[PDB]
Amino acid sequence: ADENIAKFEKAYKKAEELNQGELMGRALYNIGLEKNKMGKAREAAEYFFRAAIVFYKEHDTDGLRRAAKSLKEAITAIPEEEGRKEAKEMAKKAEEWLQAEQNN
């Protein structure tokens, strides 16, 4: 069970209480992909959001754009107990962060 994720649970160190960010985020993003591949796109969407927060702070436009894109499409793939007004709004967050990162 989890396989790649199980490794990434040890590869992703405490980023959200330490000044290490750019080294991670993308690890939660990769875990998120795997969750959606196993059908459980709820945890997928959560990890794409928490990843997008890390990318946003590190101003990693590639990963933030990549997380935003995958976020909204993992949400449409979320099974029963589909949170909707919690999980889907996270995609809208990642939209706002991404567009403000551009401001071209």
Side-chain angles (χ1 to χ4, degrees):
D2 288 77
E3 311 305 277
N4 305 273
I5 297 175
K7 179 180 179 178
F8 293 130
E9 297 182 277
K10 295 181 295 295
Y12 195 116
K13 59 191 170 191
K14 304 179 303 171
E16 60 186 272
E17 61 172 81
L18 216 293
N19 287 29
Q20 304 301 273
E22 67 290 272
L23 303 178
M24 286 155 294
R26 196 177 178 118
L28 275 183
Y29 175 81
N30 200 273
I31 296 176
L33 297 171
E34 301 296 286
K35 295 294 182 184
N36 184 28
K37 294 176 65 60
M38 297 179 297
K40 304 184 292 71
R42 179 63 214 259
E43 300 84 271
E46 303 306 283
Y47 293 150
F48 292 143
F49 182 59
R50 300 179 67 165
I53 299 174
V54 179
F55 294 128
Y56 174 56
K57 272 61 179 300
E58 301 297 83
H59 295 277
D60 190 288
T61 32
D62 175 86
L64 180 63
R65 180 177 293 165
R66 189 175 299 272
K69 186 191 61 182
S70 302
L71 223 170
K72 66 178 190 303
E73 296 175 74
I75 292 162
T76 61
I78 290 178
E80 292 60 63
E81 287 297 280
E82 45 188 69
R84 295 300 181 162
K85 235 296 179 179
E86 59 184 294
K88 181 264 182 179
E89 302 299 89
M90 302 188 310
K92 302 189 73 292
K93 291 286 184 182
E95 295 298 307
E96 302 311 285
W97 299 337
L98 182 57
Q99 300 291 31
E101 283 295 291
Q102 309 307 327
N103 191 30
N104 182 30

